[PDB]
Amino acid sequence: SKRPIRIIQWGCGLMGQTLIRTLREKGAELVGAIDHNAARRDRDAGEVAGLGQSLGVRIHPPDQADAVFREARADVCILCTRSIMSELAGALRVAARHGVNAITIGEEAFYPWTTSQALTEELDQLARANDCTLTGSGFQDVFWGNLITVLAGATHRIDRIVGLTQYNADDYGSALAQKHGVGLDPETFAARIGASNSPSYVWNSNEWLCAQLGWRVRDIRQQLLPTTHTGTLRSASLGREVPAGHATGMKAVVVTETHEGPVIETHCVGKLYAPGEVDLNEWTLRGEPDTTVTIRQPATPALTCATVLNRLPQLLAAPPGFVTTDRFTPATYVSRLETE
Amino acid sequence: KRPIRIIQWGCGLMGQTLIRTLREKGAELVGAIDHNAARRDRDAGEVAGLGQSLGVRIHPPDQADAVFREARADVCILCTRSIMSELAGALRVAARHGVNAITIGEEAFYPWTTSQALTEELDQLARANDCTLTGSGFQDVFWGNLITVLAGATHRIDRIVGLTQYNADDYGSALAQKHGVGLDPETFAARIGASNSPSYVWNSNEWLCAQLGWRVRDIRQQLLPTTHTGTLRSASLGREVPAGHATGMKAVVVTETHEGPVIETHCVGKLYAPGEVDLNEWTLRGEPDTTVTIRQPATPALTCATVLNRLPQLLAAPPGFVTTDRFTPATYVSRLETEA
Numbered sequence: 242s243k244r245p246i247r248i249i250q251w252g253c254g255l256m257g258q259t260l261i262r263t264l265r266e267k268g269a270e271l272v273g274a275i276d277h278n279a280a281r282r283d284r285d286a287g288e289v290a291g292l293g294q295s296l297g298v299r300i301h302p303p304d305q306a307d308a309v310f311r312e313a314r315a316d317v318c319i320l321c322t323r324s325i326m327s328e329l330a331g332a333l334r335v336a337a338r339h340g341v342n343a344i345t346i347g348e349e350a351f352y353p354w355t356t357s358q359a360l361t362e363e364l365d366q367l368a369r370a371n372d373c374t375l376t377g378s379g380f381q382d383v384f385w386g387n388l389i390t391v392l393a394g395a396t397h398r399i400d401r402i403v404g405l406t407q408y409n410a411d412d413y414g415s416a417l418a419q420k421h422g423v424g425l426d427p428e429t430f431a432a433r434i435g436a437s438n439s440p441s442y443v444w445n446s447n448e449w450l451c452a453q454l455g456w457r458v459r460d461i462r463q464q465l466l467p468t469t470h471t472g473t474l475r476s477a478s479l480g481r482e483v484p485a486g487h488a489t490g491m492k493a494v495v496v497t498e499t500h501e502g503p504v505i506e507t508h509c510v511g512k513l514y515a516p517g518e519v520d521l522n523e524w525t526l527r528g529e530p531d532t533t534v535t536i537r538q539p540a541t542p543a544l545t546c547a548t549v550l551n552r553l554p555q556l557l558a559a560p561p562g563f564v565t566t567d568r569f570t571p572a573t574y575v576s577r578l579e580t581e
Numbered sequence: 582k583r584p585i586r587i588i589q590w591g592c593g594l595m596g597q598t599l600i601r602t603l604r605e606k607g608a609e610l611v612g613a614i615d616h617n618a619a620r621r622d623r624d625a626g627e628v629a630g631l632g633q634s635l636g637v638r639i640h641p642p643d644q645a646d647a648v649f650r651e652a653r654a655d656v657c658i659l660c661t662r663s664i665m666s667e668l669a670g671a672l673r674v675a676a677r678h679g680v681n682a683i684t685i686g687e688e689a690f691y692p693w694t695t696s697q698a699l700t701e702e703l704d705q706l707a708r709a710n711d712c713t714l715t716g717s718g719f720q721d722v723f724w725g726n727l728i729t730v731l732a733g734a735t736h737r738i739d740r741i742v743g744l745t746q747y748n749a750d751d752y753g754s755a756l757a758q759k760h761g762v763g764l765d766p767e768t769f770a771a772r773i774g775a776s777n778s779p780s781y782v783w784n785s786n787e788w789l790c791a792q793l794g795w796r797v798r799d800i801r802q803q804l805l806p807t808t809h810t811g812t813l814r815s816a817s818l819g820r821e822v823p824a825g826h827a828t829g830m831k832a833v834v835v836t837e838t839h840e841g842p843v844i845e846t847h848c849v850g851k852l853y854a855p856g857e858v859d860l861n862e863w864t865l866r867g868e869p870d871t872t873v874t875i876r877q878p879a880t881p882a883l884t885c886a887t888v889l890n891r892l893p894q895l896l897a898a899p900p901g902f903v904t905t906d907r908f909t910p911a912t913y914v915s916r917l918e919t920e921a
């Protein structure tokens with residue numbers, strides 16, 4: 242006897258709407274919905290997600306999260322809100338206090354152990370105390386992660402791993418556009434983005450690779466450079482026109498040096514696209530032998546959401562704590578989001 | 582910790598690569614078997630092209646029991662033949678001496694339906710003697726965990742479509758022979774086409790179904806000769822193949838599941854005209870559609886490196902004939918060492 246996995250969606254923006262539609266297609270049940278956005282509070286989650294039949298799941302503001310957790314009897318909270326642990330920790334604490342497993346697409350949560358050590362250790366203790374698992378997943382899990390380590394499993398010697406990834410700032414909400422400096426003039430970009438040099442998404446995903454490959458990080462160097470176009474580009478995400486020479490987004494170059502010798506160099510571009518530009522994911526393992534993998538035009542948003550859903554049975558089965566996916570076996574295709 | 586102790590059975594092109602590379606990863610060659618007249622009584626290091634002899638004389642197979650009793654080996658690597666009926670002799674010797682065996686023999690990757698009785702016999706023998714037998718090679722990642730790791734980021738799979746191509750000349754006589762290299766069209770039809778023996782991707786498609794949790798309903802295979810407009814040399818057979826003779830074999834395997842998804846795999850093993858390269862391109866068709874390309878895979882080096890990376894898992898695995906779908910994916914290993 243199987244029952245649907247019971248999901249609270251926290252963040253009912255572009256990604257959250259995709260997850261609401263897709264979790265139901267896999268046989269899961271939406272049992273709670275939280276969003277602070279004015280336009281969405283009090284609407285039916287089904288309606289907002291573009292379903293034709295309302296779900297009977299009212300979107301609550303976050304100040305009512307404890308009420309929606311107590312009512313919902315959920316197996317899992319999916320959190321699609323912000324990129325950094327400081328801005329995710331509040332929602333993760335709520336899920337943990339209620340003993341509800343949580344998975345976030347928030348990029349830092351993929352591997353936050355050094356970048357937000359104290360928040361991660363506190364959440365790990367709380368999740369342990371309440372007998373639930375927290376984790377970070379998304380596009381990184383396969384495409385900047387297990388894709389590379391499965392190919393490393395066919396490699397005799399690795400000298401260097403080199404990654405090139407690119408995604409469209411317009412496909413995601415304002416947390417991503419903001420992190421990438423979309424619409425900033427060159428001087429403001431340098432001063433706000435370049436100067437503060439906050440860990441890019443591939444800072445955390447390169448640490449995940451080292452953890453799964455069994456390497457120890459010695460140093461990480463990052464440069465954030467504005468991306469630019471010769472014409473004006475419109476940001477539907479931030480609702481701003483970006484004139485030629487203003488930042489259309491950010492290229493991050495991260496070089497991860499290990500004690501063991503190998504280095505991971507990852508170029509990560511989030512920007513507005515000129516006509517004919519597409520998502521990229523290309524990796525080379527340099528050593529013996531040299532191997533290059535190319536994903537032809539990854540459907541980055543769809544792939545993000547599908548790995549989150551495929552992870553859910555492993556998240557339920559996982560031991561309690563904040564357990565990053567480097568400690569899991571790779572995500573497997575799940576036909577139905579149901580549990581015994 | 583001590584080096585893993587390896588008997589190399591088959592000291593041809595792949596066996597020479599393994600002898601050189603296993604030592605580079607900190608394993609120790611303790612035995613060598615080869616039936617080739619040119620290699621019998623020579624030092625395995627010398628034959629592998631090392632400048633310093635290893636003190637390991639290549640024995641003919643009629644002396645295999647003697648080399649196993651003497652060597653006290655942890656692992657036998659078997660690089661000889663493609664099909665279980667031709668591998669069984671060596672696997673029986675390894676198992677009777679309680680030594681773990683891993684073969685690049687392609688049927689051994691997943692032989693449970695194609696050679697059921699041989700596999701069940703070897704499984705009980707291996708169990709009686711407290712050792713693990715398995716099949717690995719290029720298939721393990723590039724026709725296997727590469728696909729299932731991408732499947733982990735997929736919402737719905739309708740069809741998996743594979744195109745792979747390798748150079749018949751990179752592997753020695755047994756593979757050239759299996760691919761009908763140098764056969765005239767009539768002999769090809771009669772020996773190869775007519776008998777329709779399981780191509781390598783018959784067994785690898787069954788492995789994919791086992792790891793994705795699908796049940797095979799039917800498998801259909803067409804074997805067609807490959808041809809060139811010019812004469813080509815097989816360095817493995819040392820013969821010229823004139824225009825219109827078989828330069829190798831294209832296999833098309835359609836694997837239908839009870840669940841609905843189908844795996845359609847196109848597999849070409851042939852002599853290469855100038856400019857031709859190895860290929861490995863897969864599409865997961867469904868939601869979303871994902872295409873992965875390996876740019877000119879170094880198929881031989883990848884075959885050997887995944888066998889070595891598998892060794893710690895082969896030692897750890899329970900006794901019996903345990904196909905690699907029951908293992909977690911191969912992981913990059915720096916040092917081939919074991920306890921006590």
Ligand SMILES: NC(=O)c1ccc[n+]([C@@H]2O[C@H](COP(=O)([O-])OP(=O)(O)OC[C@H]3O[C@@H](n4cnc5c(N)ncnc54)[C@H](OP(=O)(O)O)[C@@H]3O)[C@@H](O)[C@H]2O)c1
Binds near residue numbers: 251277324345
């Ligand atoms: N790991 C990955 O592979 C991956 C993939 C895609 C996106 N992401 C990231 O995950 C996050 C969500 O992406 P998205 O594109 O769906 O952004 P989005 O369209 O802005 O949607 C997020 C929703 O959450 C709301 N929100 C933000 N903070 C909240 C809080 N504390 N409580 C309740 N609701 C809150 C937002 O409201 P407002 O609009 O009012 O702020 C919005 O409705 C972003 O930071 C993005 O970078 C990660």
Ligand SMILES: [NH3+]C1CCCCC1
Binds near residue numbers: 380381442545
């Ligand atoms: N951070 C998300 C947006 C695209 C890159 C990886 C997933």
